[PDB]
Amino acid sequence: PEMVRGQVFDVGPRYTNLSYIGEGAYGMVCSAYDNLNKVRVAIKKISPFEHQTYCQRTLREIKILLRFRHENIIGINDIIRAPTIEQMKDVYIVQDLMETDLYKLLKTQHLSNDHICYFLYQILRGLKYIHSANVLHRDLKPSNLLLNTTCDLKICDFGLARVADPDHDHTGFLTEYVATRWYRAPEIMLNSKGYTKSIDIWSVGCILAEMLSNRPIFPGKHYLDQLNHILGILGSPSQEDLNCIINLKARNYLLSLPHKNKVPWNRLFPNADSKALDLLDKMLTFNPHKRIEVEQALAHPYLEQYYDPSDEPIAEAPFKFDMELDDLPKEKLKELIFEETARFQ
Numbered sequence: 001p002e003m004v005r006g007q008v009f010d011v012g013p014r015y016t017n018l019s020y021i022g023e024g025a026y027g028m029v030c031s032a033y034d035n036l037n038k039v040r041v042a043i044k045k046i047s048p049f050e051h052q053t054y055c056q057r058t059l060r061e062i063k064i065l066l067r068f069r070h071e072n073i074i075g076i077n078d079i080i081r082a083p084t085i086e087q088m089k090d091v092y093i094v095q096d097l098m099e100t101d102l103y104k105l106l107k108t109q110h111l112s113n114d115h116i117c118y119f120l121y122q123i124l125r126g127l128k129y130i131h132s133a134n135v136l137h138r139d140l141k142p143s144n145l146l147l148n149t150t151c152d153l154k155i156c157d158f159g160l161a162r163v164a165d166p167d168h169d170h171t172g173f174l175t176e177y178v179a180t181r182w183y184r185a186p187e188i189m190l191n192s193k194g195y196t197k198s199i200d201i202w203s204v205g206c207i208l209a210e211m212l213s214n215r216p217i218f219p220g221k222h223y224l225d226q227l228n229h230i231l232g233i234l235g236s237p238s239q240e241d242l243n244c245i246i247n248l249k250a251r252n253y254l255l256s257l258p259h260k261n262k263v264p265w266n267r268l269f270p271n272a273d274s275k276a277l278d279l280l281d282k283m284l285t286f287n288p289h290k291r292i293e294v295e296q297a298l299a300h301p302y303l304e305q306y307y308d309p310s311d312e313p314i315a316e317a318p319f320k321f322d323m324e325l326d327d328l329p330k331e332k333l334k335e336l337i338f339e340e341t342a343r344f345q
């Protein structure tokens with residue numbers, strides 16, 4: 001077969017010249033030469049079958065990426081697995097190899113206003129397709145945004161994605177654990193389960209702030225510290241925004257806080273394009289109901305050199321409902337993964 005950094009990687013004969021890229025929990029990524037298409041690809045090895053939650057994420061990611069077809073969304077080129085359910089222990093996902101990710105780029109490179117503009121456009125173009133399919137990404141962050149050598153951007157990792165459910169969004173105070181901390185909308189900590197499109201917009205606003213300065217705008221050190229950073233920049237919510245928060249625990253926590261003034265965007269980002277700061281303000285709006293939508297963000301004057309609604313496609317078939325798999329045993333999830341991957345055999 002093939003071994004990488006003390007681990008089996010049975011992708012051959014089609015894929016050879018294996019080189020380690022990175023690793024996560026139960027997931028390992030390698031680059032490899034595709035002998036059929038004569039190009040280097042990215043191969044992710046997943047072994048989720050012992051954990052029901054890992055099976056959930058694997059199935060969700062596979063189902064979504066197989067249905068989506070968009071230039072700003074990473075596709076699935078091939079899926080490698082054993083010919084039978086009994087012999088299937090690992091799943092290998094073959095995807096286009098990208099040069100870097102926005103996280104790695106932001107750590108060493110200053111972005112020009114043109115780059116920020118092109119990157120934001122592509123993120124919103126991809127996000128318009130995702131929201132049109134009634135899907136929420138729920139984990140938008142720089143490390144989930146891949147880039148090629150020509151700055152073409154692709155959104156990846158749909159493992160935490162859900163079908164939008166605005167009707168069932170309300171919850172209690174300090175309960176929800178949606179997105180990566182620094183990219184978590186303020187409503188997650190107050191009264192939202194993160195079942196509305198507005199949570200993706202907040203994350204995009206955080207990414208834009210990070211492209212402008214090369215630093216996370218709200219670097220909370222822990223879960224409870226996140227709301228302190230957001231309110232430290234945005235200032236105290238208005239009476240109108242507090243009237244939208246009916247949960248007494250969340251409302252009284254906000255009322256207990258001393259008055260804080262809004263730190264102006266121009267003071268935080270003195271080099272930023274004024275139009276980028278106007279758009280940033282609209283994405284990083286405290287009240288989710290007043291927060292700008294993906295289609296409005298695309299039409300903002302900051303993006304006027306790229307804006308073309310006829311070249312910003314929507315999904316052919318939206319997801320009607322979410323799959324009832326939070327209680328499906330790992331064995332039934334294994335069969336579904338097996339069925340979903342059969343087209344690649």
Ligand SMILES: *CCS(=O)(=O)N1CCc2cnc(NC3CCOCC3)nc2C1
Binds near residue numbers: 029074096146
């Ligand atoms: C969210 C993408 S991933 O982590 O599942 N994954 C699979 C797809 C892919 C494609 N290309 C690359 N390239 C690397 C090169 C080194 O810098 C980071 C990106 N990575 C991935 C990761």
